[PDB]
């Protein structure tokens, strides 16, 4: 497992791998706000 | 950004508006590299957190940990985890480097100048130019050669690399005499891809791998030096298309081929991908099952488990006859000059070989998307899909898609160079200047 | 001293979230590179310091 | 004439015999035009062999003018095979008549339209006047860049 | 003679395909 | 059977050489307009 | 019938999308597509009416024959075995 | 004639949660099992029956189902 | 106003919301 | 001119009845050899030991089979993945007994179809048209490669490839469903959806266009909008035809990728024993009957 | 479950960042 000093921060790590997927959605929402000019 | 009217590209082709903007393209590339290292660090940390060092690395779905292990960090003889700190430090270092690269990417993407041609002539290129592109290619070739030589240096003057063919199971060894002989190195390239010959996937000993990396590093450094101080030959100018999309097409084709090669290497090879970390290959699982049954019934002349090969060697019987080209560290000692050695099959079978074979028997590369290990007709008992299957499937899909990308972009590049990307002339089209077909 | 290490790491998380949510909104805004040209920059230094702050402590944890 | 009904069927997109006669007419017209261009080129060369340089230049220019539009060669040429040699002859004939700037412009156009034989340009004597203008060498290096950057490698080896 | 009639039918189909390819009427 | 092997190798090499030289023969794409 | 219908859909879409005119009158060149498919495959459509009617006709006939077969199965009238092979 | 004004989002912000809570209560209270006759997880196999029930009748189906359903 | 489009939208939507709530409640229970 | 000049002019000539580009130089001999060997083997070929246990399977026309049951048996299992040319067999009879013709035909046919895909682009470039028909053709060729090449590689033997026949195709499909749950796999689901949608859209487009005939794209668009409530889509003919091209191609790409993934033993969903009861008594579902059928197929498939 | 609750709150905080940035740029009048 993770080292004890960083043990309480394990739940945050449990969501870290998903953020890179969210960037294409961020691009889509940016284009939508721009209204696809 | 920009609109369709001023660029001619819709929103779903928006990145195509960056072809003529050097600074924006550089920022986008840097941000994407930041994304890559972000995923590397985040996945490393996630797999470290969900890690039980007692169990084998392949019983739980780890992908990057086998990599860091086969580099030779925190691994004892036989694949035991000495400690799990280097994995953590690798993950956190990759994450911090990701933060740096992401900041650089966003800065270059939306603060810095759109075009670098004027202010900074050194970092200024036009796709039509044929010398600055070679300069960039030479710089990046130098970088790749430095990386390969860094790998060689690590394997030769540091803790070493995990050699899985060490006697009595795999161990972390320091290579002391890599094979620099050109003949043996390029025999892999000239080798056949069928049957016993697996092309570069057939590499077995770590000495050949290290020697080949030495050769590739020095060749890449020399090629970079050559390309920095050179302009393409006239036939090279006549044969290629010099535009951004053409370079992208070439890269896509090369990277798709590399994806296919990686799929094959991950599925078949078991030396650069040690079985202690990625699990046994399909042929390894079948041969191990046959060997385990043979020894179990022996302790109870072919012994209802041996057979003659099509060329005349002793091989394990049953359907496993198809996997008779397999070579493994736990089976080579029992091998003889002509197939398996009956006397060696009868005696001198160390308990560790039997234990490893039994362990590999129950973890054959079978699985399901639902994550239910075993055959498709088996009930839901255990969840296990081998990392080899995941790697092979994912990279085969990526290689196929990137080959399709090469096709598309190469076609479009040729059409744009010829001036056909818009459509038919509507006034003088080539077909109207042709004799009617008979 | 794991407690102060955890406190500093929480501070690092907070400052990183502030930086990631503030840098794009101060860059894309018109003439946003000027008014905070040092200010935001200074924050980055702090961020950098913070990671080294949690580096040395790891050697003494 | 038949162009009206060819356009009529084209507006619907049904091919048919209406397009066939237009296609044959265009094919035979371009074949005879190419033959006429070839014979004009031969006549211009013959008249150039014995002075009469202005007449040969005019004939070659007329040959250039009668160029097909949006040409697509069998080997993906995108230009008439006689086009490059006629452009080079324009460059040569003008170069023998001073006016070096337009002559090197025509040579640039010729090299743009093919004519990879850069050695002939260097060894040509008729372009000797073009040798006087350094813009000739500028266009040549734009279209023929020596592979090895000798000065940079010599400078690096020096230090 | 079943193989004979099968082969004859297949060869007839191939001949029809060839004639359609090479002996089509002009537009 | 070695003669058949040599025959097949010669045929394949001839065809591949013809293919490569043919693709080397043609000239690069260019826009006559601009 | 069903596989041929899918093939026709793909061919028609790709062919129309790859013979467009640059911009009443048609948006694509029928002559160029006809030449291409005549010199690639061997036969090619020359009438828009016939092409689109063929696209209509193929799947309907395929499904109708399938329905007739299922009607036959409803009475256990099966093309099950070859007596000579048995 | 799209109307996504605040008026819409305030008039429809009361009935929708009411419907959601109604469905949640419908499932939780157990009315779903009673209305549709779906057996509860502790009623699939009764004391007298320990296998999948069989109908094997047409005009006697009603009271036969009532008998073999434990009621 | 009880126009036809209103009738169609509400008839499609109300059972959808009810069923979504029911299915979430099913998710809540063991299985 | 040189003989090479005239040869090049004839090869790249666009006046031939069938265009034969530089890609065609490899396409024609390869396809001709493939079809010649296929015809000769299908009409007359000795039984092939598909399993390597001296139990030959006959598939020729002269050995009893009719058109439906005839096939070219895939190569033996003793060969494995070894390259098996006609010049490495001990004898011609031995080559026939181990199913060499299957290997020869599949190799030449794959090379031919790849060169055909290249030739499509070549002629598209010659005529001055946008070169993306090859991309559309890339889907059936990818499916053929996955059927004939990738799956044997994953399974470790050419004997697992699709037999060149009809009954052989059915046997391959049934055995595949037995070993891998093909039907309960998302990529096969998208393949089926792509094929069905391709047929549906082909019928719809054909009907609309042939019904909008003048003695009118606007009239057809209005009819379609009034029919299926789609008032704000497919107004542009170019977009409509692009969607027509895109749907089946993507479906076939995904089903070929699913085939390739299963080649490495990554089967579909396995919802066996999923629904349970209090005290842990399994309650059957439709997936359980599917499992029973797969179990029967797998049990009867084996021979030892 | 404190761990699950912390996971969900961290997830919502980390996912709301991008929409917050785009909304702020839209309202203030940035380059967007
Ligand atoms: C050319 C096309 C491929 C032909 C060869 C196909 C093949 O059987 O290739 C197999 C080879 C690997 O060969 C294997 O190589 C193995 C090497 O393992 C040996 O050595 C290993 C290392 O120690 C282990 O010890 C192992 O136990 C031991 O057996 C064995 O020899 C196997 O018998 C042998 O089959 O893959 C390779 O070399 C790399 C091949 C990469 C391409 C393969 C996929 C091509 C897909 C084309 C279609 C894509 C879609 C197109 C769309 C349009
Ligand atoms: C909705 C949530 C969901 O569905 O979540 C599913 C998964 C995570 O779910 C977890 O998936 C796990 C998978 O088992 C893994 O871990 C197990 C031990 O727990 C075993 O080690 C096993 O071998 C190993 O496969 C377990 O089943 C967990 O119980 C389960 O919660 O999401 C993820 O993985 C996220 C990453 C998705 C994969 C990313 C691409 C990888 C390449 C895929 C290529 C496929 C090509 C063909 C496709 C057709
Ligand atoms: C990883 C993939 C990737 C990358 C690197 C880029 C990068 C880029 N795109 Mg592309 N794009 C992509 C995917 C990508 N895009 C996809 C998938 C689509 C389809 C929807 C598009 C569609 C598209 C269009 C239509 C256009 C671009 C444009 C651009 C450029 C400027 C965008 C801009 O002005 O931002 C402005 C963004 C905002 C105002 C809102 C977002 C604010 C930030 C950047 C979001 C990220 C913040 C980050 C999380 C915080 C990091 C903190 C840091 C300290 C680490 C830039 C080079 C434009 C361009 O330059 O063309 C000329 C343009 O016109 N893109
Ligand atoms: C391969 C990546 C790459 C390349 C080619 C460049 C190239 C350049 N950068 Mg960038 N930069 C990068 C990565 C890169 N940088 C990264 C990762 C960071 C984050 C540390 C930065 C941060 C950065 C800043 C802050 C500045 C540059 C500047 C410059 C220019 C002068 C050096 C030059 C155009 C300078 C410049 O000229 O700005 C326009 C400048 O002010 N860069
Ligand atoms: C002095 C010339 C020079 C040098 C040294 C580099 C070096 C680099 N460039 Mg390049 N680049 C240059 C000029 C140069 N660039 C110019 C003039 C341009 C045009 C503006 C670019 C445009 C450019 C782009 C668009 C990209 C790069 C990227 C990179 C980095 C890739 C690292 C990587 O993934 O390797 C992998 C291998 C290793 C890391 C092993 C090496 C380990 C050490 C160094 C061994 C010692 C690398 C540091 C890429 C990147 O990620 O940048 C952030 C990228 O996407 N460059
Ligand atoms: C990824 C890195 C990379 C890239 C993109 C390039 C790209 C290029 N190089 Mg560079 N080069 C590199 C690495 C790279 N090189 C390295 C590492 C070296 C050191 C060995 C060199 C040494 C080098 C020299 C010495 C020369 C080039 C040349 C060229 C150009 C011609 C391409 C070519 O070889 O013809 C197309 C590809 C081939 C003909 C394949 C040949 C590969 C070997 C010999 C046989 C492989 C057989 C294979 C099955 C395919 C057969 C193809 C058939 C035509 C024979 C092109 C711009 C030439 C040029 O004009 O630049 C000045 C040139 O003279 N390169
Ligand atoms: C690193 C490789 C690379 C690079 C730099 C580019 C760059 C570019 N491509 Mg190319 N392309 C590539 C690979 C690449 N492509 C591959 C592999 C394919 C085959 C699929 C394509 C197919 C392709 C087409 C068909 C087109 C482009 C276009 C473009 C341009 C605009 C980008 C775009 O589509 O808008 C921004 C990106 C998007 C809008 C895409 C967002 C939606 C996608 C589908 C998300 C998919 C995610 C999905 C979950 C992935 C699952 C994979 C899994 C199944 C394995 C740009 C020059 C377009 C163009 O204008 O050409 C000039 C265009 O028409 N590309
Ligand atoms: C190098 C490539 C070599 C390719 C060789 C293969 C080419 C195949 C050519 C098939 C022609 C079929 C007859 C067309 C008859 C014909 O003349 O059609 C002509 C027709 C064009 O008609 P028009 O547009 O001129 O019609 C005008 C109207 O007035 C109606 O007449 O073309 C088509 O309909 C396209 C559909 C092709 C459908 C192809 C089906 C293929 C079936 C193959 C069966 C194989 C059996 C094998 C048994 C062993
Ligand atoms: C251009 C653009 C774009 C994109 C962008 C991008 C993609 C960016 C990226 C960026 C990035 C890529 C970033 C990154 C970042 C990162 C960071 C910032 C990190 C940090 C880290 C941390 C914070 C950690 C921490 C920790 C540790 C150390 C371990 C464990 C514990 C803890 C968790 C504490 C789009 C398309 C969308 C749209 C348009 C515009
Ligand atoms: C390290 C290593 C190694 C090795 C490595 C090496 C040695 C590599 C090399 C590699 C190489 C050495 C590669 C090469 C490649 C090549 C290529 C890839 C080519 C290509 C070409 C092309 C692509 C061309 C094309 C064309 C033609 C054909 C003509 C016309 C024009 C064009 C351009 C289209 C070993 C195994 C020892 C160990 C392990 C690892
Ligand atoms: C890792 C981490 C970090 C970072 C973070 C970030 C940077 C994030 C981002 C995130 C993002 C950036 C996100 C985004 C998202 C988005 C979304 C989640 C969406 C959703 C939903 C929906 C529903 C949508 C929809 C839509 C679209 C958009 C498309 C189509 C149209 C529509 C409208 C429908 C830090 C270092 C600070 C700290 C630690 C943790
Ligand atoms: Fe149509």
Give strand ranges (E) for H21-65: none
Closest-CA distance, E3 to chain G, in angstroms, reads 14
Q: How far is the centre of ligand 5, averaged over its atoms, from the C-alpha of B41 (Å)?
A: 20
DSSP tag of J162 = P
CA gyration radius, chain J: 25
Residue J180 labeled ligand binder = no
- Residues C32, D101: Cα–Cα separation, whole Å: 52
Calculated CA dihedral for residues G4, G8, G9, G11, nearest 10 degrees: 130
* Ligand at shortest distance from the CA of E11: 8
Q: Are chains B and G in contact at 3+ CB pairs closer than 8 Å?
A: yes
Q: Is residue B172 within a helix (H) or strand (E), and if so which, with residue range?
A: strand B171-173
In chain I, residues with a C-beta closer than 8 Å to the C-beta of H28 are 25, 28
Atom of ligand 3 nearest to the CA of B12: 19
Burial class (CB in 10 A: 0-12, 13-18, 19+), G77: exposed
Closest-CA distance, B423 to chain F, in angstroms, reads 14
> Strand, coil or helix: what is D148?
strand
Q: How far is the centre of ligand 3, averaged over its atoms, from the C-alpha of B104 (Å)?
A: 14
Closest-CA distance, K30 to chain C, in angstroms, reads 4
Q: Is the CB of B216 under 6 A from ligand 10?
A: yes
> Strand, coil or helix: what is B215?
helix
User: Is G47 touching E (CB cutoff 8 A)?
Assistant: no
J135 close to J252: Cβ distance less than 8 angstroms: no
Please give the distance of CA B191 from its chain centroid, rounded to a whole number: 19
Strand partners, B306: B316
Q: Which one of G19, G22, G38 has the shortest CB-CB distance to B422?
A: G22
| Touching B: F residues 1-34, CB under 8 Å | 24, 27-33
Please give the distance of CA J91 from its chain centroid, rounded to a whole number: 32
Q: Which of B147, B145, B158, B153 is nearest to B72 (CA)?
A: B158
* Crossing angle of the two packed helices J133-145 and B387-418, in degrees rounded to 10: 160
Q: How many residues in total does chain E contain?
A: 27
B56 close to A33: Cβ distance less than 8 angstroms: no
B249 close to B416: Cβ distance less than 8 angstroms: no
- Residues G16, B332: Cα–Cα separation, whole Å: 61
- Residues F19, D73: Cα–Cα separation, whole Å: 19
Q: State the number of CA atoms in the 13 A half-sphere of B10 facing the CB.
A: 1
The pair of structure tokens assigned to D87 is: 């452009």
* Best mutation target, D7, D9, D12, D13, to test chain G (most G CBs within 10 A): D13
* Crossing angle of the two packed helices G2-17 and J237-263, in degrees rounded to 10: 130
Q: Which of B2, B35, B33 is nearest to B18 (CA)?
A: B2
> Closest residue of B to D152, CA-based?
B229
Report CA-CA distances (Å) from I3 to I7, J201, J273.
6, 33, 50
Please give the distance of CA H62 from its chain centroid, rounded to a whole number: 20
Q: How far is the centre of ligand 11, averaged over its atoms, from the C-alpha of B393 (Å)?
A: 28
Q: Which of B174, B126, B138, B130 is nearest to B154 (CA)?
A: B174
Q: Name chain J's partners: 3 or more CB pairs within 8 A.
A: B, D, E, F, G, H
Q: Is the CB of A9 under 6 A from ligand 11?
A: no
Closest-CA distance, J262 to chain D, in angstroms, reads 43
Residue J160 labeled ligand binder = yes
The pair of structure tokens assigned to B406 is: 């090469």
Q: Is the CB of J103 under 6 A from ligand 2?
A: no
Residue tagged 């402590």 (tokens): C57
Q: Which one of B422, B426, B431 has the shortest CB-CB distance to G35?
A: B431
> Strand, coil or helix: what is G11?
helix
The pair of structure tokens assigned to J260 is: 């390739």
Closest-CA distance, A5 to chain C, in angstroms, reads 6
Q: Is residue B308 within a helix (H) or strand (E), and if so which, with residue range?
A: strand B306-308
Strand partners, B75: B81
Sign of CA dihedral J77, J82, J85, J91: negative
Report the pocket of ligand 8 as residue ranges, CB < 6 Å: E 10, 13-14, 17, 20-21, 24; G 41-43, 45-47, 50; J 18
Encode B246-282: b = buried (16+ Cβ within 10 Å), e = exposed.
bbbbbebbeebeebbebbbbbbbbbbbbbbbbbbbbb
> Strand, coil or helix: what is B219?
helix
User: Is B111 touching C (CB cutoff 8 A)?
Assistant: yes
- Residues B153, B214: Cα–Cα separation, whole Å: 9
Report CA-CA distances (Å) from D65 to B285, D47, D69, J107.
76, 19, 11, 53
Nearest CA to ligand 4 atom 2: B30
Enumerate residues 6+ apart whose C-beta is below 8 A from B268: B198, B201, B281, B283
K7 close to A15: Cβ distance less than 8 angstroms: yes
Q: Is the CB of B382 under 6 A from ligand 6?
A: no
Q: How many residues in total does chain F contain?
A: 34
- Residues B266, B243: Cα–Cα separation, whole Å: 35
Please give the distance of CA H35 from its chain centroid, rounded to a whole number: 6
J213 close to G49: Cβ distance less than 8 angstroms: yes
- Residues D13, C28: Cα–Cα separation, whole Å: 51
* Best mutation target, E24, E25, E26, to test chain G (most G CBs within 10 A): E24
Q: Are chains K and G in contact at 3+ CB pairs closer than 8 Å?
A: no
Q: How far is the centre of ligand 7, averaged over its atoms, from the C-alpha of B27 (Å)?
A: 18
The CA-CA-CA angle for residues B127, B129, B130, to 5°, reads 110
Instruction: Kindly give the pairing relationship between strand B306-308 and strand B171-173.
Output: unpaired
Give the distance between the most distant pair of CA atoms in chain G. 66
Q: Which of J167, J179, J159 is nearest to J266 (CA)?
A: J179
- Residues H22, D43: Cα–Cα separation, whole Å: 99
> Strand, coil or helix: what is C36?
coil
Q: Is the CB of B254 under 6 A from ligand 6?
A: no
User: Is E20 touching G (CB cutoff 8 A)?
Assistant: yes
Q: Is J61 left (phi over 0), alpha (psi -120 to 50) or beta?
A: alpha
Q: Which of B161, B170, B167, B250 is nearest to B208 (CA)?
A: B161
Q: Is residue J165 within a helix (H) or strand (E), and if so which, with residue range?
A: strand J164-165
> Strand, coil or helix: what is J163?
coil
The pair of structure tokens assigned to G11 is: 């061919």
Instruction: Kindly give the pairing relationship between strand J71-72 and strand J164-165.
Output: antiparallel
Please give the distance of CA D78 from its chain centroid, rounded to a whole number: 11
Nearest CA to ligand 11 atom 4: K14
Task: Provide the terminal-to-terminal Cα distance of chain K, rounded to the nearest Å.
Answer: 41
Closest-CA distance, H44 to chain J, in angstroms, reads 8
- Residues G47, G23: Cα–Cα separation, whole Å: 24
Strand partners, B230: D148
- Residues H22, B74: Cα–Cα separation, whole Å: 57
Please give the distance of CA F22 from its chain centroid, rounded to a whole number: 6
Q: Name chain K's partners: 3 or more CB pairs within 8 A.
A: A, C
Report CA-CA distances (Å) from B194 to B51, B186, B320, J115, J158.
38, 17, 18, 22, 11
> Closest residue of G to E27, CA-based?
G46
Please give the distance of CA B62 from its chain centroid, rounded to a whole number: 16
Enumerate residues 6+ apart whose C-beta is below 8 A from H55: H61, H64, H65
- Residues J295, J287: Cα–Cα separation, whole Å: 12
- Residues H19, D101: Cα–Cα separation, whole Å: 86
Cβ within 8 Å, pair E6-J61: yes
Q: State the number of CA atoms in the 13 A half-sphere of B58 facing the CB.
A: 25
Q: Which one of B11, B14, B39 has the shortest CB-CB distance to A17?
A: B39
**Alpha-helix runs per DSSP H in B240-334:** 244-268, 275-278, 282-299
Phi, psi (5° rounding) for residue E24? -75, 150
User: Is B100 touching C (CB cutoff 8 A)?
Assistant: no
> Strand, coil or helix: what is J229?
coil
- Residues B290, B304: Cα–Cα separation, whole Å: 11
Q: Cβ atoms within 10 A of the Cβ of J41, count?
A: 25
The pair of structure tokens assigned to J114 is: 């790849």
Q: Which of G37, G53, B76 is nearest to J133 (CA)?
A: G37
Q: Which one of G22, G32, G38 has the shortest CB-CB distance to B437?
A: G38
Q: Is the CB of F23 under 6 A from ligand 10?
A: yes
């Amino acid at each position: 497992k993770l080292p004890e000093a960083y043990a309480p921060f394990a739940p945050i790590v449990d969501v870290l791998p998903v953020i890179p997927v969210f960037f294409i959605l961020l691009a889509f929402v940016w284009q939508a706000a721009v209204s696809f000019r | 950004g920009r609109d369709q009217e001023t660029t001619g590209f819709a929103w779903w082709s928006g990145n195509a508006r960056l072809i003529n903007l050097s600074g924006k393209l550089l920022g986008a590339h840097v941000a994407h590299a930041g994304l890559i290292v972000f995923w590397a660090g985040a996945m490393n940390l996630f797999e470290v957190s969900h890690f039980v060092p007692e169990k084998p690395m392949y019983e739980q779905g780890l992908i990057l940990l086998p990599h860091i292990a086969t580099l030779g960090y925190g691994v004892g003889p036989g694949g035991e985890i000495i400690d799990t700190f280097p994995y953590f430090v690798s993950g956190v270092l990759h994450l911090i480097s990701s933060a740096v690269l992401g900041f650089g990417g966003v800065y270059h993407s939306l603060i810095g100048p759109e075009t670098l041609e004027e202010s900074y002539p050194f970092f200024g290129y036009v796709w039509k130019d044929k010398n600055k592109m070679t300069n960039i290619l030479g710089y990046h070739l130098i970088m790749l050669g430095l990386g390969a030589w860094l790998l060689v240096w690590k394997a030769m003057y540091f803790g070493g690399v995990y050699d899985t063919w060490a006697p009595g199971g795999g161990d972390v060894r320091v290579i002391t005499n890599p094979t620099t002989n050109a003949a043996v190195i390029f025999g892999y390239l000239v080798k056949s891809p069928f049957g016993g010959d697996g092309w570069i996937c057939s590499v077995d000993n770590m000495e050949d791998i290290i020697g080949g990396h030495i050769w590739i590093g020095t060749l890449e450094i020399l090629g970079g030096i050559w390309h920095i101080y050179t302009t393409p030959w006239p036939w090279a100018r006549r044969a290629f298309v010099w535009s951004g999309e053409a370079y992208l097409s070439y890269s896509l084709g090369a990277i798709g081929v590399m994806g296919f090669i990686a799929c094959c290497m991950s599925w078949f090879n078991n030396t650069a991908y040690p079985s202690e970390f990625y699990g046994p290959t399909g042929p390894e699982a079948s041969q191990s099952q046959a060997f385990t049954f043979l020894v179990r019934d022996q302790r109870l002349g072919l012994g209802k488990y041996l057979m003659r090969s099509p060329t005349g060697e002793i091989i394990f019987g049953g359907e496993t006859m198809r996997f008779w080209d397999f070579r493994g560290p736990w089976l080579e000692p029992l091998r003889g000059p002509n197939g398996l050695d009956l006397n060696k099959l009868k005696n001198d079978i160390q308990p560790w070989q039997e234990r490893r074979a039994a362990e590999y028997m129950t973890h054959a590369p079978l699985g399901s998307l639902n994550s239910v290990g075993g055959v498709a007709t088996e009930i839901n008992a255990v969840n296990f899909v081998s990392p080899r299957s995941w790697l092979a499937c994912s990279h085969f899909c990526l290689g196929f898609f990137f080959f399709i990308g090469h096709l598309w972009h190469a076609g479009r590049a040729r059409a744009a160079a010829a001036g056909f990307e818009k459509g038919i002339d509507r006034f003088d089209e080539p077909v109207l200047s042709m004799r009617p077909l008979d | 001293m794991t407690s102060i290490l955890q406190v500093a790491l929480l501070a690092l998380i907070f400052v990183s979230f502030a930086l990631v949510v503030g840098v794009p909104v101060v860059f894309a805004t018109p003439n946003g590179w000027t008014d905070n040209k040092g200010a935001v920059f200074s924050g980055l230094s702090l961020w950098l310091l913070l990671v080294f702050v949690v580096g040395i402590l790891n050697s003494f944890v | 004439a038949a162009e009206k009904q060819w356009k009529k069927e084209r507006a619907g997109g049904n091919y048919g015999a209406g397009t066939k006669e237009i296609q044959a007419r265009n094919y035979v017209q371009r074949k005879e035009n190419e033959r006429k261009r070839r014979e004009m080129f031969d006549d211009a060369l013959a008249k150039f062999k014995e002075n009469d340089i202005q007449g040969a230049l005019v004939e070659f220019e007329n040959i250039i003018a009668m160029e097909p539009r949006n040409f697509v060669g069998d080997n993906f040429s995108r230009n008439t095979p006689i086009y490059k040699v006629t452009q080079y002859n324009i460059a040569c004939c003008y170069s023998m008549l001073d006016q070096v700037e337009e002559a090197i412009k025509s040579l640039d156009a010729a090299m743009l339209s093919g004519f990879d034989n850069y050695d002939q340009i260097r060894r040509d004597k008729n372009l000797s006047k073009a040798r006087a203008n350094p813009k000739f060498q500028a266009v040549l290096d734009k279209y023929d860049e020596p592979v090895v950057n000798w000065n940079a490698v010599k400078a690096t080896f020096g230090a | 003679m079943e193989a004979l009639v099968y082969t004859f039918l297949l060869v007839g189909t191939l001949g029809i395909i060839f004639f359609s390819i090479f002996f089509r009427d002009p537009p | 059977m070695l003669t058949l092997k040599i025959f097949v190798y010669t045929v394949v090499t001839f065809f591949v050489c013809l293919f490569i030289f043919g693709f080397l023969s043609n000239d690069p794409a260019r826009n006559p307009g601009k | 019938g069903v596989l041929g219908a899918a093939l026709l859909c793909a061919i028609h879409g790709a062919t129309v999308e790859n013979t467009l005119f640059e911009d009443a009158e048609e948006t694509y060149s029928m002559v160029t597509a006809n030449r291409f498919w005549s010199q690639i495959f061997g036969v090619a459509f020359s009438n828009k009416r016939w092409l689109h009617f063929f696209m209509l006709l193929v799947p309907v006939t395929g499904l109708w024959m399938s329905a007739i077969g299922v009607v036959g199965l409803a009475l256990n009238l099966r093309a099950y075995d070859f007596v000579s092979q048995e | 004639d799209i109307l996504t004004s605040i008026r819409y989002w305030v008039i429809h912000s009361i009935t929708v949660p009411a419907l959601f809570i109604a469905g949640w209560l419908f499932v939780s209270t157990g009315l779903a099992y009673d209305v549709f006759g779906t057996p509860r997880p502790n009623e699939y196999f009764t004391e007298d029956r320990q296998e999948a029930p069989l109908i094997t009748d047409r005009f006697n189906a009603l009271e036969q189902v009532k008998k073999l359903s434990g009621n | 106003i009880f126009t036809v489009r209103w009738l169609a939208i509400h008839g499609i939507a109300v059972p959808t919301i009810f069923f979504l709530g029911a299915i979430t409640a099913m998710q809540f229970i063991q299985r | 001119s040189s003989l090479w000049a005239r040869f090049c002019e004839w090869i790249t000539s666009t006046e031939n009845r069938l265009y034969i580009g530089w890609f065609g130089v490899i396409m024609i001999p390869c396809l001709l050899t493939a079809t010649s060997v296929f015809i000769i083997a299908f009409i007359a070929a000795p039984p092939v030991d598909i399993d390597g246990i001296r139990e030959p399977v006959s598939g020729s026309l002269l050995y009893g089979n009719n058109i439906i049951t005839g096939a070219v048996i895939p190569t033996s299992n003793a060969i494995g993945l070894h390259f098996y040319p006609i010049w490495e067999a001990a004898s011609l009879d031995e080559w026939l007994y181990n199913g060499g013709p299957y290997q020869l035909i599949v190799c030449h046919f794959l090379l031919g179809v790849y060169c055909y895909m290249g030739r499509e682009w070549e002629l598209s470039f010659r005529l001055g048209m946008r070169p993306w028909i090859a991309v559309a053709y890339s889907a059936p060729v990818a499916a053929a490669s996955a059927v004939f090449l990738v799956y044997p590689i994953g399974q470790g033997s050419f004997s697992d490839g699709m037999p060149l026949g009809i009954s052989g195709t059915f046997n391959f499909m049934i055995v595949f469903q037995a070993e891998h749950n093909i039907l309960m796999h998302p990529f096969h689901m998208l393949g089926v959806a792509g094929v069905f949608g391709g047929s549906l859209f082909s019928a719809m487009h054909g009907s609309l266009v042939t019904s909008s005939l003048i003695r009118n794209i606007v009239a057809a668009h209005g009819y379609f909008g009034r029919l299926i409530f789609q008032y704000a889509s497919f107004n542009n003919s170019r977009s409509l035809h692009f969607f027509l091209a895109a749907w089946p191609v993507i479906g076939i790409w995904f089903t070929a990728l699913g085939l390739s993934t299963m080649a490495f033993n990554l089967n579909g969903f396995n919802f066996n024993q999923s629904v349970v009861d209090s005290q842990g008594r399994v309650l059957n579902t439709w997936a359980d009957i599917i499992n029973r059928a797969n179990l029967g197929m797998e049990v009867m498939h084996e021979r030892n | 479950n404190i761990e699950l609750a912390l996971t969900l709150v961290s997830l919502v905080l980390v996912v709301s960042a991008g929409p917050l940035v785009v909304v702020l740029l839209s309202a203030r009048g940035g380059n967007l």
